[PDB]
RNA sequence: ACCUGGUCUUGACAUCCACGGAAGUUUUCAGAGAUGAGAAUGUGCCUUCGGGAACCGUGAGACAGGUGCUGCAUGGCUGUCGUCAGCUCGUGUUGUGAAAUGUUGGGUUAAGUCCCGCAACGAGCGCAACCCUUAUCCUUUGUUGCCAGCGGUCCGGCCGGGAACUCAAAGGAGACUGCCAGUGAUAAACUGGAGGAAGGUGGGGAUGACGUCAAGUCAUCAUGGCCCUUACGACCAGGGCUACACACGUGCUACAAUGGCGCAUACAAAGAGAAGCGACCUCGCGAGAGCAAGCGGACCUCAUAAAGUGCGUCGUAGUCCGGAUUGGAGUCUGCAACUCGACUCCAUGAAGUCGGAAUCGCUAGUAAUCGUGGAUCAGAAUGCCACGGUGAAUACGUUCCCGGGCCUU
C-alpha cells in the first residue's frame, strides 16, 4: 500500500467537504466520486455517497472503517450467480 | 489513430513541459526525509491541484506518422509497420535485414 | 627442445594459450595446478590425452591460460592447444595426433534461437483443434 | 506467396541507402521525422517535375537534399528562383541550413519510380491499363534494360471483381542478390478505388 | 595528446575518414598511433510484418555502428589547426578529446 | 531414415577404467545432462558391487550384462492380411543397449535409499539371475519362443 | 476504442473572412472535473512608426470530425499448401478441335541437378551461386583490449615496458569431387582413400516460383460506395476491458534423495544505459533508504551466472517435498495501488505421491536441463526475442499412419 513516509492519501475536495460538514450539523449525504480517499478519524458519523460507476451508494462511516478506502464499501460489479 | 486522440497527446506533452519544475520541487519536498509533518501535507495536497495531464506518466508513445499506440519503437519513433516500410524503402540509415 | 613452443586451442566459446618447454611434468593453468583447476576427471583426462598418446607426459612443462566457456569447453580447447604445441615442437607427431583425432578443431557451436520456436529446434506444442 | 522487398534485400549489397547520416538514439527519431516531412513536402510540391529519388544527408548541423529528376529545368526555374524557394522551405522545416542539389535522371523510361508514376497518371486519366503497361515495357526494352516487369492490381477498367495483371520481358532474377533491380510502386486513385502499380527493372549483374 | 573517436554506419566510410585523418596528421609533423578498430556495436530489432495477427511472421533488422580510435601524441601547432577544417564526409561522427 | 546417411558417433571412454562400455552405461543413466552426477552414481554402485563380489568392477559388470543380454526379440511385421510378431535376432550393439536400459529402468523402479544402492542391488541380482530386467529378458525370450512359428516373414 | 453521469456545437484537430486584443506569467472562489466567474502582472518584435505577423479570444459559413458499415468493391501488407521442385512462354511440328510436344524416356541428383537419347529448337520464373554468420590460417593496427621474454613490485598487468599471445576489425587465403583407386554407357555420377580446421550443399540464417483458400486485416495507414452531423463528432470524473456454476488451448511450479536445506568454492556468452545505468560508505532481517563516484561507455554501472564441486544434515515421511491460499506488518513507482501493481518480512502450509481415452516436440552441440540479457515500459513477464553452461538416447528399415513429388491407368 501507500508508503508510510508519505502519509495516507485524501482528495483535497473531499477534505474540504468533510471539514465544512463536521463543524456544522449537516447530516445530508456527502456525494463524491473519490473512491481512492482513505477514511480519516474525523468524519465518523455522517454518510458519504461513494460513486460505484453508475450511482452513489451511501456508507455510514464508523470507527472500524478507519484506514480503508471509500471504494472498499462501494462494490462496482453486479453478480447474482449463474442460472440462479 | 483519431485526430482527437493525437491532440490529446500533444496537449499532454505541452502540459507536462509547462508544469515540469512545479511538480519536481513538490515531489522533492514530499520525499524529503528531514521535512516537517505539515509542509509535507501541504505539498501532497498541492500536487493534486495541478492538472492530471501534466504528469509525464499520462503520456502514451504513438507512431509519429500514424498515431498507432501499439508496437512502438523508441529508436525510430514509429510503429513496427512504418519502421518496416521505411527500412525497405531505404530511409533508415544503416538499417538492413539482419541474419546471424 | 630448447625454446618455448606455443599453441592456440579453441572449443565452444573457450580460447586457450599453451606454452610448452622441456621439463619434468608440471602443469599450471591460470596460475593453478591441474587438479586445482579441473575438478572433473573427464576434464583431467582430456587435458592429459595428447601427452599419454605421445608418451611425453613427464618430459614437458605446461603453462596454460584459458578464458571463456565452461569446464568441458576449456578442457577441449586446452587439448587442442596442447596438440598444436606438440606439433610445433616435433612435426613427426602430426600423423599420430590426427589419427587420434586431436588435430581437428571441434566446430560445434550453440545453434541460435529462431523465431516461432522455443529453442533452436523445439517447436511449441501443436494441436489440430 | 509474399516476396521480400527487392530494394530492402539489396540495401547493403548493390543498392545504396536513401538517407546517409549518423545519429545517436537521442536524435535518431527526430531526424527520421524531419526527413519524412521534408520528403513529403518535396513530393507534394514537385508533383509535375518527374522526381524519382530524394536523398538526404546531414553532414554537420545542416541538411543537404539531392533531388533526382528528369525535368531539372522545371525543378530549378528561372535563375534558380524555384530551387531557392524550395531551399528556404526545406531549411524552415528541418530547422537547419539547407542545401539543395539537382541530379539528372537521363532516360526516365529506365527509372522504376518514374515508370510507375507515368502508368498511374495514365490510369487516373482513364487510359487502357493494358496499353499503358505494354507501352512501358516496350519503352524500357527498347532503351536497353535487360528486363522489366510491370504489375497492376485492383478494379482494372472499373470491374467489380479486382484482379492482378503483369507483363514481363527479358530476365528479372529476383533471387540473385547481386542483380541491379530498380523496384518501385505507385497508386492511382480512380473513381472506382485504388489501383496499385509495381515496376521492376533489371540493369545487369554487378 | 589528443583522441579522435570516429563512429559510422558504414565501415568503408569510416576507413576513408581514418585514412585521410592519419594522412593529414602525419604530413603535418606529429606522429599517429593506430588507427584502432574498436568493437562494432550490433543493435537488433524484431518486428511483426503482418498488420494483423500472424505472430510468428517477423522481420529481424540490425544496425552496425563501427568505431575507430586515433591517437595523436605530441601534437604540433600546425598539426592541431589542420584537423577541424578537414570537413569529413557526411555520415561520420567525430569526437575530439584532449587527453 | 529413408536415405541411409547416418554414420556413427565416437564416445569417450570412462575416466576410472577407460571402457566405452561403461561410458555408454553412464550415458544411459544420465538425466538432464548431469554427467558428473551419473558418473558418481555409477562409480559408487560399481565399488559396492566389487566389494560384494570377488571380481573387479568390469568383470562383475560383464557378468551382469551377460545375464541380462537378450538374443532374439519380437518385432511387428504388417503384410497382406494381419500383422505378425516376427522373432528377429538382436545384433550385439542392440544387445548391450537393451541390457543397459533394462538394468537402469529396474534400478530406478527399485525402492532402496540411494540410486547407487539401487543400482548395486540390481547389478547383484542380475549377476545371480534374479529380479527385474532378468524377468524382462525372460519375457522377451518367451514371446520369441511363442512366435517362433513366424520366423520366416 | 465500452458503460453511467456531467457538458460543447464551425467544434478537440485544419484553411479561409471580420473584430477585439502581444503572447505569456501570479493568485481567489465554485464544481468533481470538464468549465465558469474573476483578480494582478507584462504588452514585447519589423514598422516608410499606413501596417503588421506570431499567438489568443469572439462572431458567422464553406467545412472539419467518425477505432461508424461493407476485407464479398479495393491498394498495401500477411498466413497457407511449401523452401515443395515445380510453373510456363516464343518459334517449329502433330491434331477438325479442346490440346499435345518441348517438360516424356535410360541413368543420376537435395534439386526440371546433370549427362545421354529424342520433332523439337530455344528462352523465362523457380534450383544452385552471388549475401550474413560460424569453423582454420596470413597481413595491417594495438587502446579503454593482451602479458611470452625482461626490470621492479604494496603480489593487484599494479608500474616502467613489450607487439609476442588471447582478442578487437579491416583486407586477403582456404573446399573446388581439386587429386588417387574402383564402378559406371569411353557420360553424368556414385563408393572409398590421401592431404586439410573443415569433404562432398562443412553447420546455421536470409532468400518463398506460377498460383490456391472471395483465407486475414476498411481498428496501423490509404481508399470506392454507404451512413451520422446541437451527434455514430468533441471534453471530463467514476466504473469496465481483471466478472465466474463451467468447457478448451498455450505455459509455469511440483509431486522429491540423480533431491531439499546450510556453509565454502569455481568456469560464460550476449546486451543496455542520460527525465538513464547507478558504484563506494552508512542505516534497515529484507524489499529498500540517505549520501554520493564513474560512465554517452573494450574504461563506469547494470552484474554475484546457475547447474557444477567439497563438507554436514535430512532417511522415504504428504516429510526439513511441494508453496497454493489467507491474516498481520511494510517498501517502491506513480496526482492516485479499493475495484486492480510488483516486491519484502512474520505466520499460515492447499492440491499434488508421476497423471484415462487420447495427444505433442526433437536426428547433435539437437533433445533435456541450468542460469543471463533485451524490446515494450513511471511501475507492471511463468509471454516474446536473444545468449551462453552441462549435455544424451536412437535411426535395423520404408510393410503401415500423415503430407508431398514424378510416370501410368
Ligand atoms: K487484400
Ligand atoms: K484425335
Ligand atoms: K508450342
Ligand atoms: K471504406
Ligand atoms: K478502470
Ligand atoms: K505461463
Ligand atoms: K497445460
Ligand atoms: K513442508
Ligand atoms: K491496482
Ligand atoms: K493417379
Ligand atoms: Mg484518420
Ligand atoms: Mg504508459
Ligand atoms: Mg541453450
Ligand atoms: Mg495455432
Ligand atoms: Mg479476402
Ligand atoms: Mg510439369
Ligand atoms: Mg505438357
Ligand atoms: Mg533449371
Ligand atoms: Mg529432353
Ligand atoms: Mg537459392
Ligand atoms: Mg472472406
Ligand atoms: Mg472477419
Ligand atoms: Mg476516463
Ligand atoms: Mg483482455
Ligand atoms: Mg520447503
Ligand atoms: Mg530433420
Ligand atoms: Mg519495465
Ligand atoms: Mg522430380
From Swiss-Prot, chain B:
GO terms for molecular function: rRNA binding; structural constituent of ribosome; tRNA binding. Disulfide bonds: none annotated. InterPro entries: Ribosomal_uS14, Ribosomal_uS14_bac/plastid, Ribosomal_uS14_CS. The keyword rRNA-binding does not apply. It comes from the Bacteria. GO terms for biological process: cytoplasmic translation; ribosomal small subunit assembly; translation. SUPFAM superfamilies: Glucocorticoid receptor-like (DNA-binding domain). Keywords: Ribonucleoprotein, Ribosomal protein. GO terms for cellular component: cytoplasm; cytosolic small ribosomal subunit; small ribosomal subunit. Part of the 30S ribosomal subunit. Contacts proteins S3 and S10. Binds 16S rRNA, required for the assembly of 30S particles and may also be responsible for determining the conformation of the 16S rRNA at the A site. Belongs to the universal ribosomal protein uS14 family. This is Small ribosomal subunit protein uS14. It comes from Escherichia coli (strain K12).
From Swiss-Prot, chain C:
One of its GO terms (cellular component) is cytosol. It comes from the Bacteria. The keyword Translocase does not apply. Signal peptide: none annotated. SUPFAM superfamilies: Ribosomal protein S5 domain 2-like. Coiled coil: none annotated. Belongs to the universal ribosomal protein uS9 family. NCBIfam families: PRK00132.1. This is Small ribosomal subunit protein uS9.
Curated annotation (Swiss-Prot), chain D:
PROSITE patterns: KH_TYPE_2, RIBOSOMAL_S3. Signal peptide: none annotated. Keywords: Ribonucleoprotein, Ribosomal protein, RNA-binding, rRNA-binding. InterPro entries: KH_dom, KH_dom-like_a/b, KH_dom_type_2, KH_sf_prok-type, Ribosomal_S3_C_sf, Ribosomal_uS3_bac-typ, Ribosomal_uS3_C, Ribosomal_uS3_CS. One of its GO terms (cellular component) is cytosolic small ribosomal subunit. Belongs to the universal ribosomal protein uS3 family. PANTHER family: 30S/40S RIBOSOMAL PROTEIN S3 (PTHR11760), SMALL RIBOSOMAL SUBUNIT PROTEIN US3C (PTHR11760:SF19). Part of the 30S ribosomal subunit. Forms a tight complex with proteins uS10 and uS14. With proteins uS4 and uS5 encircles the mRNA as it enters the ribosome, which may play a role in mRNA helicase processivity. Some nascent polypeptide chains are able to cross-link to this protein in situ. In collided ribosomes contacts ribosome rescue factor SmrB. This is Small ribosomal subunit protein uS3. It comes from Escherichia coli (strain K12). The gene is rpsC.
Swiss-Prot record, chain E:
PROSITE patterns: RIBOSOMAL_S10. One of its GO terms (molecular function) is transcription antitermination factor activity, RNA binding. One of its GO terms (cellular component) is cytosolic small ribosomal subunit. Part of the 30S ribosomal subunit. Can also form a heterodimer with the transcription antitermination protein NusB. Binding of S10 to NusB is mutually exclusive with its incorporation into the ribosome. The rRNA transcription and antitermination complex (rrnTAC) consists of RNAP, NusA, NusB, NusE (this protein), NusG, SubB, ribosomal protein S4, DNA and precursor rRNA; S4 is more flexible than other subunits. Belongs to the universal ribosomal protein uS10 family. InterPro entries: Ribosomal_uS10, Ribosomal_uS10_CS, Ribosomal_uS10_dom, Ribosomal_uS10_dom_sf. The keyword Ribonucleoprotein applies. SUPFAM superfamilies: Ribosomal protein S10. This is Small ribosomal subunit protein uS10. It comes from the Bacteria. GO terms for biological process: cytoplasmic translation; regulation of DNA-templated transcription elongation; ribosome biogenesis; transcription antitermination. Keywords: Ribonucleoprotein, Ribosomal protein, Ribosome biogenesis, RNA-binding, Transcription, Transcription antitermination, Transcription regulation.
